[PDB]
Design a protein around this nucleic acid. Structure first.
Ligand SMILES: [Mg+2]
Ligand SMILES: [Mg+2]
Ligand SMILES: [Mg+2]
Ligand SMILES: [Mg+2]
Ligand SMILES: [Mg+2]
Ligand SMILES: [Mg+2]
Length: 136
RNA sequence: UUCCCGGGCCUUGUACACACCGCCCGUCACGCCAUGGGAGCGGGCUCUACCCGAAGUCGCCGGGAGCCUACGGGCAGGCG
């Protein structure tokens, strides 16, 4: 027995070091790349378009426009190749997956996605709190 | 003395004048050139309508928040 508990044992690859976010709010993920036997940390930053929750190997995809072409990247949420991920802004999604933005991509999405104050306000307030409460 | 040939004088018509064995016209054939049309093909300029929209000035907001304050202000920022 413990069919899932065994496969759930299987991960020493879970990682707690990355931030909370949901679809709709924009983030920036730094990712190890090769680029000809050298090594670089490339950043990729756009709206997170969706999140697939499987526990370990959940994955989340990020969309942005780059030099006049939309791009989506799909990252494994536990990937050993993610150095860090910063949330660069929060936004109010209204539904789980937003693919609908692909056929907007214009000003109409900054109207559809207006920033989520509740989670913004609780970020600052969480950052003031942890800042004040570490030192003294 | 009508007719054929040549000739003389006057006259008349002429686009002939190396002068009627003159001049000249239009198709057709050939060569060269330029040009119209032509299923279309390419390009330039332009107009109309609608979508998206940089930088920017302008206008409204500056609030569940920021910063400075000379705080019933200004700034970042947001929207048009
Ligand atoms: Mg079990
Ligand atoms: Mg005569
Ligand atoms: Mg003759
Ligand atoms: Mg002659
Ligand atoms: Mg022609
Ligand atoms: Mg517009």
């Amino acid at each position: 027995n413990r069919g899932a508990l065994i496969k759930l044992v299987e991960s020493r690859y879970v990682r707690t070091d990355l931030p909370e976010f949901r679809p709709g709010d924009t983030v920036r993920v730094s990712y190890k790349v090769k680029e000809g036997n050298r090594t670089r940390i490339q950043d990729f930053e756009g709206i997170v378009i969706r999140i697939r929750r499987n526990g370990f190997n959940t994955t989340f995809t990020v969309r942005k426009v780059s030099y006049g072409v939309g791009v989506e990247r799909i990252f494994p949420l536990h990937s050993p190749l993610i150095q860090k991920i910063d949330i660069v802004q929060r936004g109010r999604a209204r539904r789980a997956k937003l693919y609908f933005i692909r056929n907007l991509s214009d000003r109409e999405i900054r109207r559809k996605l207006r920033a989520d104050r509740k989670r913004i306000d609780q970020d600052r307030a969480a950052e003031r709190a942890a800042k004040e409460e570490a030192q003294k």
